[PDB]
From a paper:
Cryo-EM was performed on fibrils assembled from 30 μM IAPP in the same buffer used for kinetic assays (160 mM ammonium acetate, pH 7.4, 1% v/v DMSO), in the absence (4 replicates) or presence (2 replicates each) of 50 μM YX-I-1, canagliflozin, or doxazosin. Fibrils were imaged after 2 weeks, at which point fibril formation was at a steady state, as judged by analyzing aliquots with ThT. Fibrils with a similar morphology were observed for the control (no small molecule) and doxazosin-containing samples, with the majority having a twisted ribbon morphology and crossover distances of 60–100 nm. Following helical reconstruction, multiple distinct IAPP fibril polymorphs were resolved, revealing further detail on the apparent morphological differences between the samples. The majority of fibrils formed in the control (69%) and doxazosin-treated (72%) samples were classified into three related fibril structures (named LL, LLU, and LLUU, respectively), which have a shared structural core consisting of a pair of protofilaments related by a 21-screw symmetry. Each protofilament is formed from a single stack of L-shaped IAPP subunits, with straight β-strand segments encompassing 13ANFLVHSSNNF23 and 25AILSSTNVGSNTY37-NH2, hinging on a turn at Gly24. In addition, further flanking subunits presenting U-shaped IAPP subunit conformations and ambiguous β-strands were observed adhering to these two β-sheets, with the combinations of these flanking subunits differing to generate the three individual polymorphs LL, LLU, and LLUU. Thus, out of the fibril structures that were identified in each data set, YX-I-1 fibrils consisted of 89% C-fold subunits, whereas this subunit fold was absent from fibrils grown in the control or with doxazosin. By contrast, the control and doxazosin-treated samples consisted of L-fold (62% or 72%, respectively), U-fold (34% or 28%), and S-fold (4% or 0%) subunits.
Residue numbers in the entry:
A (entry chain B), B (entry chain D), C (entry chain F), D (entry chain H), E (entry chain J), F (entry chain L), ...: 15 to 37
The structure:
Amino acid sequence: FLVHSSNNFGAILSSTNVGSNTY
Amino acid sequence: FLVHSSNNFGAILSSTNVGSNTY
Amino acid sequence: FLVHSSNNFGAILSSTNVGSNTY
Amino acid sequence: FLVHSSNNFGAILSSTNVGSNTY
Amino acid sequence: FLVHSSNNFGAILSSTNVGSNTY
Amino acid sequence: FLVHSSNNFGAILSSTNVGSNTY
Amino acid sequence: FLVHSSNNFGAILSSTNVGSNTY
Amino acid sequence: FLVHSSNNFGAILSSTNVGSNTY
Amino acid sequence: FLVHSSNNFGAILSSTNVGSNTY
Amino acid sequence: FLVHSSNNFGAILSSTNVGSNTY
Amino acid sequence: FLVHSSNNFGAILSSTNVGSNTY
Amino acid sequence: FLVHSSNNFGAILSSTNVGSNTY
């Protein structure tokens, strides 16, 4: 018997930069 | 019997920079 | 019988820089 | 019988820089 | 029977720099 | 029977620098 | 007069997971 | 007068997963 | 007159997990 | 007149976990 | 006239965990 | 006239845990 509940009521602003690597 | 509840009511601002490595 | 409850009501500002390493 | 409750009502500002290592 | 309760009502400002090592 | 309660009502400012070692 | 030279002769294996956040 | 030279002679294996967030 | 030279001849293995935060 | 030279000839293994915070 | 030279010939193993904070 | 030379020929093992704070 497993129960997983996730409730979100809030504003979420996200910025993600992955890279910009010089080889 | 397992119960996992996560409730979020707050604003979340996130910035993530992964990289910028010179090799 | 396991119960895990996480409630968040507060603003969260986060900044994460992982990298900028010169090799 | 295990109970883990975490309630957060406060503003959280975080800054994390991991790196900037010269090899 | 184990109970772990953590309640936070206060502002938390954190700064973390891990690195800046010259090899 | 184990009970662990931690309540925080105070502002917490933290600064952590781990590194800056020349090898 | 600015000169930026980056030469890489070594194998580079990288894994990056950004996310897996429950709101 | 600006000169930017990047030469790469090495194998580069990369894996990037951005996401898997439950809202 | 500025000169920045970075030469890498060594194997580099990196793993980065940013996230896994429950709100 | 500025000269910055970084030469790396050694294997570098790194693991970085930033997060896993419960709010 | 400024000269900064960093030469690394040794294996470097690093582990960094930043977080795991309960609020 | 400034000269900064850092040469490393030795194995370096490091472990860093920053956090695990209950608020």
